[PDB]
Design a protein around this ligand. Structure first.
Ligand code: CL
Length: 116
């Protein structure tokens, strides 16, 4: 699908509505390996190590679950080695190296990927 990288560091919360407000979309929802490869190349030029996506791990206590912010189905995931359980915060982050997803604390200010 269509996607756009934003380079301005913003916390996950800041980043989500930047897509809705500035570009009229949501954080990117990845559904196959091709699209996740297209994004890997787009963030290779970033000195940053991670970028935000629509992945937000929710759950109360021991009920941690994964949902896209745009509401799309969770039919694919490319988690890194030593990810995701037993670490991280409540927001998913794509590692700029290789394209592996990694959990991160939402308050981290990283670039992000909007889809439209
Ligand atoms: Cl968090």
């Amino acid at each position: 699908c269509r996607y756009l990288l934003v380079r301005s560091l913003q916390t996950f919360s800041q980043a989500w509505f930047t897509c809705r407000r500035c570009y009229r979309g949501n954080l990117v929802s990845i559904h196959n390996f091709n699209i996740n490869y297209r994004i890997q190349c787009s963030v290779s030029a970033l000195n940053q190590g991670q970028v935000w996506i629509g992945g937000r791990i929710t759950g109360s206590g021991r009920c941690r679950r994964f949902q896209w912010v745009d509401g799309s189905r969770w039919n694919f995931a490319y988690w890194a080695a030593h990810q995701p359980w037993s670490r991280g915060g409540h927001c998913v982050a794509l590692c700029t190296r290789g394209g592996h997803w990694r959990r991160a604390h939402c308050l981290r200010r990283l670039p992000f990927i909007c889809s439209y």
